């Protein structure tokens, strides 16, 4: 396989504008959403086909009691942040916790925890220690390492649960997570010569130009990855032409294990 | 799911004692050992979650995750221990699977 | 006081109806209610993982339960069976959806369901 990762967030918002949930929690398979929960609906949903299909209402229905939990526990840890900040207002808390299953068959796993979307507390599951930001994160960091335990049990849950989490959702998804798409390139002027690429999957690409067999990065323009609507994506890459002497330029796109290569006449 | 623990046990006073608990679960998040004197409430003894072994006054707790295997170690024992100990376990969905329990006698 | 059930002991006639009551006073955000038969693990009839929220446990049938505060959670025999003799506990724990946290009992509810 390519390279695979899970992941679940949680948004707390203090003191939301009408309407808009005070708490959301969203999962992740690649840039696939599978599940999803807020203070509103009070229900964990399926957000993939293929997560509905192969997770009995079991499931949703014990994991809608538990972010209900989890959502009091935000509730609670941002009241106490937003104290000891000594802010007023509308704040943001955040944590996302996930792991990836790379091509070569290693792992990684990651938690972390924002504050008004800014780095806020940072778990290190091989030394077993939190890296707090400023003071009021120190305190936290204090009171969670305390409980050697907890420290433990969330090693264990990124190195072991979560990876049989995310393998058993690439086997529910394997249509569409496995699949491959080849993209469709094209080159044209507007002086700049732009290299556009569209109805790829999966997302990761790499786009770049070259000037006479040669790269040089600070020259070119990378537009970013973007979803097209319907599964797949697209992407460009621009550079500006050199009236000034005769130069070979050609784009080349990587994706999937293929290269290609257009070169501009 | 499925968890295993002798139904009872005896040993003499002063000596040690190894109480078993294997399991078969969906997931595993930690392996849990209570003490329940007869007539009264559970109270928590230890959590295991990594493998290895870990120490509490006269009593150790070991964990085998690739096993499924944890053991409670009494060693010292005094009459006071009389008493059985539950083994748990929390599964993939964070539900506590309950053994049995071994009922430990004491010889003084 | 930790957690505290009542009543330590109850005779019922079949038919007859019971609420067993149970508080704790730590703050906790999640309470259970199982029962304990000989020969068997402890089984969950009814949990409440916070204020606001409960739902079944393995064998909830004949049972209801009110989480009536963050204190308080009250486990109800409608119409009690014989089949129901058990001892019954109460317990709490900071929270449901974490790994390490430890289970707090009350003393236990001994029910004789009787004919």
């Known amino acids: 396989m390519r390279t695979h990762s899970l992941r679940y967030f949680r948004l707390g918002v203090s003191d939301p504008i009408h309407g808009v949930p005070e708490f959301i929690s969203v999962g992740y398979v690649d840039s696939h959403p599978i599940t999803t929960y807020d203070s509103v609906t009070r229900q964990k949903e399926p957000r993939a086909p293929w997560m509905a299909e192969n997770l009995a209402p079991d499931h949703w229905e014990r994991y809608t009691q538990l972010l209900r939990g989890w959502q009091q526990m935000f509730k609670v840890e941002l009241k106490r942040l937003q104290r000891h900040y000594n802010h007023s207002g509308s704040h943001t808390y955040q944590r996302m916790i996930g792991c990836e299953l790379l091509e070569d068959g290693s792992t990684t796993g990651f938690l972390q925890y924002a504050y008004d979307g800014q780095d806020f507390l940072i778990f290190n599951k091989d030394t077993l220690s939190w890296l707090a930001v400023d003071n009021v994160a120190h305190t936290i960091k204090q009171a969670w390492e305390a409980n050697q335990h907890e420290l433990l049990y969330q090693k264990n849950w990124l190195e072991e649960e979560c990876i049989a989490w995310l393998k058993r959702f690439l086997e529910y998804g394997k249509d569409t997570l496995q699949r491959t798409e080849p993209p469709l390139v094209r080159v044209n002027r507007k002086t700049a010569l732009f290299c556009k690429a569209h109805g790829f999957y999966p997302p990761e690409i790499y786009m770049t130009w070259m000037k006479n067999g040669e790269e040089i990065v600070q020259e070119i323009d990378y537009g970013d990855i973007l979803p097209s609507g319907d599964g797949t994506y697209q992407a460009w890459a621009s550079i500006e032409l050199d009236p000034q002497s005769s130069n070979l330029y050609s784009c080349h796109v990587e994706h999937s294990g293929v290269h290609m290569v257009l070169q501009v006449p | 799911q499925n968890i295993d623990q002798p139904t009872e046990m005896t040993a003499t006073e002063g000596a040690i004692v190894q109480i078993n608990c294997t399991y078969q679960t969906s997931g595993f998040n930690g392996l849990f050992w209570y003490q329940q004197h007869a007539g009264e409430a559970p109270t928590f003894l230890s959590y295991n979650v990594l493998d290895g072994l870990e120490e509490k006054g006269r009593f150790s707790s070991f964990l085998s995750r690739s096993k499924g295997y944890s053991y409670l170690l009494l060693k010292e024992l005094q009459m006071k221990d009389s008493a059985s100990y539950l083994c748990?376990?929390?599964?993939?969905?964070?539900?506590?699977?309950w053994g049995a329990g071994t009922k430990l006698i004491i010889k003084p | 006081a930790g957690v505290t059930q009542t009543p330590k002991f109850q005779v019922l006639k079949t038919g007859q109806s019971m609420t067993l009551q149970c508080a704790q006073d730590m703050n906790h955000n999640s309470m259970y209610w199982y029962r304990q038969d000989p020969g068997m693990g402890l089984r969950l009839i009814y949990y409440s993982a916070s204020e606001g929220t409960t739902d079944k446990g393995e064998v909830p049938n004949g049972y209801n339960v009110s989480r009536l505060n963050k204190r308080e959670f009250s486990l109800r025999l409608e119409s009690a069976a014989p089949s129901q003799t058990s001892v019954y506990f109460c317990?709490?724990?900071?929270?449901?959806?974490?790994?390490?946290?430890?289970?707090?009992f009350g003393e236990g509810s001994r029910l004789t369901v009787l004919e």
């Open positions: 748990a376990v929390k599964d993939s969905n964070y539900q506590l699977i």
């Open positions: 317990a709490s724990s900071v929270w449901t959806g974490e790994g390490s946290g430890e289970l707090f």
